[model samples]
Target: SLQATTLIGHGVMVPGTTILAGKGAEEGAVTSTTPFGVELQQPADKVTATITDKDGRVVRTLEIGELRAGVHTFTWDGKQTDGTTVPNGSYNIAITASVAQPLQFALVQGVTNLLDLGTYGTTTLDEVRQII
Candidate 1:
């Protein structure tokens, strides 16, 4: 029996309690202008999601208000927080959510496998697919 390597594994984690970790969707994995997304845990009234460049520059900030404990998404159509766009490149999604309850950690990304076979890879697989 032979099976193509499908359903690869991609993911993130929270090493410590109450930590923030996120990044852009692998290549074109996102289906909308709001590509960057994260799952919310606990509950909160306001959560701030920020997009930053690899150089640690604030690109965009989403002041999410009236929130729920679920998945939230954001966008970055080459534009930045300063109302200016950049060349096609990499970005990261950093989110911070809180609730009126006790301190809760940002739900670990778990296992978000990075994989795409669009048109037989007439595409690119991003997100640190493999190690050399």
Candidate 2:
């Protein structure tokens, strides 16, 4: 019997001491689990994500409105909101945070996959007697 395997991968944080607007402009990489699920995270509220391809073409956009100071996780099944599978390739993940306050936003990319089992079946195996 074959078992389902799903693995999630994450990218490194953009190089920067702080997340200031127009300063240390860095982009995170999109990660996927089982080449299906994709996600992104932000360190602060008022952050947004813009996904693009290597050719600089806009792929998808997400608006992560006001968030608290903590870790946030976003999950995607490698599909767009319109019920379509996105092409498998490298993508850029960008985040922007802070409003009236001078706060910095951090970009973190992650992913999670839900594996499915075809079906269940009973199995039996022979065992040999052993001494205690």
Candidate 3:
């Protein structure tokens, strides 16, 4: 079952985690221009980081591949996913660690059709669906 841990509403008390405020979490608060850095106590795989505005909107996201135990830094271009600048406001960082990687293609076609359509570098899920 994908859902059965117990506690109705208890905090997750795990060891060797919680390293957000140690290295450089709140480095830039008054201004939302500075990138965030975090120290990792253990190796993390398929890690992704995101910055959410006060109103609960994801302003930036980065897909970090893998990180060893140490201090790591990431940057946000100060823009929303739809090519718009975010207003100066309070924001928070969220980290999600998984055990997989992104696929070369959005979904799947046939293995024989993995041809080059000439559109290279940086694409969106919508755009990929439309073209591919």
Candidate 4:
């Protein structure tokens, strides 16, 4: 015997989460200097934010210490990691932090003759992997 049920792709929200965005995610572009803010949905540890160019080269790295669950702002003087002024170009923002939360998920069952159940859903096979 066998079981079959069609489903749709979807996602779930758990306890743990992180947030990071740069001046409208595009205004981070550096001319002479720019001011941007970062948002943390929950208190984070050992936080770090970086700015990179279109070529995916790191231009500046901000060593931000511990932060509370809220919005924090900082300014970049358009300088590179080499301590020199960055040339005219596009730049991007990225952030990393540590958080604590619960973990629980469903599992697929095997084929059966009478056992019947159904649900719809998804993952990238995985996305936003939990890191310590």
Choose the strongest candidate by TM-score. Answer: 4
* Pairs of residues at least 3 apart in sequence or in different chains that clash in candidate 1: 10-112, 10-113, 34-74, 59-81
In model 4, pairs of residues that clash are: none
Query: What TM-score should be assigned to candidate 1?
Result: 0.46
| Candidate 1 lDDT by residue in tens digits, 1-132 | 011133233221211112223435687542223244445566676777666666777767767666676544434455556766554445555667663221212211222232332221211233222211
Off by over 4 Å in 3: 1-32, 98-132
User: Tens digit of lDDT per residue, candidate 3, span 12-118?
Assistant: 11111111211225855532243345455577877886667766777777677788865555545666678776665445566666422212212221222122222
- Leading candidate by lDDT: 4
> For residues 26-99, could you state the per-residue lDDT of candidate 2 as single tens digits?
47544342211112243354566665556766666766676665434444344455666566554455556752
- Quote the positional error of residue 107 for candidate 1 in Å: 22
lDDT of each: 0.42, 0.35, 0.43, 0.47
- Expressed as tens digits, the lDDT of each residue in 1-132 for candidate 4 is 321221112122212211222323365653454334455679887777777777787777878789887655555666678887766655666767773232212222322322121231233222212211
Indicate the residue-level lDDT of 20 in model 2: 16
Per-model TM-score, in order, reads 0.46, 0.39, 0.45, 0.48
Off by over 4 Å in 4: 1-31, 99-132
